[PDB]
Paper text:
Here, we report the crystal structure of a SAM-dependent methyltransferase from anammox bacteria ([name]) that has a substrate and active site pocket between a class I SAM methyltransferase-like core domain and an additional α-helix inserted into the core domain. Two SAM-MTs ([name], 2) are found in many species and genera of anammox bacteria. [name] is categorized as a class I SAM-MT, which has a Rossmann fold and is the largest family of SAM-MTs, and the enzyme is unusual because it is phylogenetically distant from homologous SAM-MTs in this family. Structural comparisons with homologous SAM-dependent C-methyltransferases in polyketide synthase, AmxACP pull-down assays, AmxACP/[name] complex structure predictions by AlphaFold, and a substrate docking simulation suggested that a small compound connected to AmxACP could be inserted into the pocket of [name], and then the enzyme transfers a methyl group from SAM to the substrate to produce branched lipids.
We determined the crystal structure of [name] by single-wavelength anomalous dispersion (SAD) phasing at 1.60-Å resolution, and one molecule was found in the asymmetric unit. [name] has an NAD(P)-binding Rossmann fold similar to the αβα sandwich core domain, which consists of seven β-strands and five α-helices and is commonly found in class I SAM-MTs. An α-helix (α9) was inserted between β-strand 7 and α-helix 10 of the core domain. The core domain and α9 are covered by an additional α-domain at the N-terminus, and S-adenosyl-l-homocysteine (SAH) is located in the pocket between the core domain and inserted helix, although we added SAM to the enzyme for crystallization. The ribosyl moiety of the bound SAH forms hydrogen bonds with D202, a water molecule, and the main-chain NH of G182. The terminal carboxyl group of SAH forms a salt bridge with R159 and a hydrogen-bond network that includes a water molecule and several main-chain atoms (carbonyl groups of Y181 and A249; and NH of G184 and F185). The adenine ring is surrounded by aromatic side chains F138, F203, F232, Y254, and W229, and its edge is exposed to the molecular surface. In the crystal structure of [name], a similar long pocket and SAH were found between the core domain and inserted helix α9. A His-Glu dyad (H304-E308) and Y254 were also found on the surface of the pocket. The substrate binding pocket of [name] is shorter than that of CurJ C-MT and narrower than that of citrinin synthase CMeT, implying that the substrate of [name] has a short chain connected to AmxACP3 through the phosphopantetheine group.
Numbering used by the authors: 17 to 95, 115 to 349
């Protein structure tokens, strides 16, 4: 299991030994001790975040209790995977080595194997039915940040839609074309027309019946996330729909992410994919719902522990 693997990492790197010897710590004190005692170079946001995720996971797994903002180590009384490869590298990354993977040509096979997994296929299929079930055929849909094209493939498997495909790099386009059911029917937009998150989408206002946005939310920088979703709102027709597949950072309130296995799994996913170039991490679900509402979306559906979102433009 992935959680057991990350716990084994925590123990083998001496993180658990350090924290139990400290006995009590705030997140700030723990991060200072990771720097001073383990020698981690927490020199950027993504590495500082990984260290925070480790503490959050130890708390979720009941190694720690919390009073106010202070954690306490709980003393016990007497008597092959993409994720595996990420965790195998995490010690090197935390010591300041470059990201393990990126969205460049050399890494395309890695992403193809990872994003083809059954859990992603399930989440995409649910969202596709949420967006298109019961609709008139041949909706105009933007497949945004489509990568290897599993999203386009599943959309064409399930429904007759007119896909416009856009990514911020063109490194996957040939692989996606050789995967989907109807490559001639797709409007492939050249990646030179869109620098990516933070730049306006190269489409006019109110053009699309739907925007499909799967597994790309955690690559949006915090500084740009409001704009990215406002700009998507701009290109949707009134009555159009934005579908998101992501994960939600486990919420203390347990309002959105309830399944204990999923709460642990999301933390381990976030820690692991932090070794990939550009990872920003999963966002808090209450803040996401608040953001979508202020932009002007109606929150039609939140499902799968707040991993699948249907957002309608009124
Ligand atoms: N800074 C950035 N701006 C726009 N897209 C970005 C980006 N960083 C990553 N991405 C894109 O986000 C995607 C992450 S992988 C998800 C691919 C596909 N949607 C699927 O469901 O499997 C990739 O297409 C990647 O090119």
């Amino acid at each position: 299991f992935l959680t057991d693997r990350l716990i084994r990492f925590v123990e083998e790197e001496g993180i658990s030994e350090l924290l139990q010897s400290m006995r009590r710590f705030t997140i700030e004190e723990a991060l200072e001790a990771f720097r001073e005692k383990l020698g981690y170079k927490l020199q950027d946001r993504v590495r500082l975040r990984m260290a925070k995720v480790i503490v959050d996971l130890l708390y979720e797994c009941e190694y720690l209790e919390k009073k106010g903002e202070r954690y306490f180590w709980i003393e016990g009384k007497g008597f092959v995977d993409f994720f595996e490869r990420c965790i195998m590298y995490a010690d090197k990354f935390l010591n300041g080595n470059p990201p393990l993977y990126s969205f460049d040509s050399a890494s395309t096979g890695i992403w193809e194997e990872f994003l083809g997994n059954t859990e992603f296929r399930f989440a995409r299929s649910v969202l596709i039915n949420l967006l298109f079930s019961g609709r008139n055929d041949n909706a105009t849909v933007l497949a945004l940040c489509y990568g290897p094209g599993f999203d386009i493939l599943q959309m064409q498997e399930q429904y007759n839609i007119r896909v416009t495909a856009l990514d911020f790099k063109d490194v996957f386009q040939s692989q996606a074309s050789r995967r989907i059911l109807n490559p001639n029917s797709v409007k492939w937009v050249q990646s030179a027309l869109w620098k990516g998150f933070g730049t306006p989408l190269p489409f006019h206002d109110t053009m699309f019946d739907a925007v499909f946005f799967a597994c790309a939310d955690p690559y949006i920088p915090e500084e740009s996330r409001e704009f990215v979703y406002k700009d998507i709102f701009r290109v949707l027709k009134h009555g159009g729909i934005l579908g998101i597949v992501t994960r939600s950072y486990p919420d203390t309130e347990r309002k959105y992410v309830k399944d204990p296995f999923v709460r642990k799994g999301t933390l381990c996913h976030d820690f692991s994919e932090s070794v990939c170039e550009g990872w920003c991490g999963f966002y808090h679900p209450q803040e996401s719902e608040n953001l979508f509402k202020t932009i002007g979306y109606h929150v039609n559906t939140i499902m799968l522990n707040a991993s699948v979102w249907r957002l309608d433009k009124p």
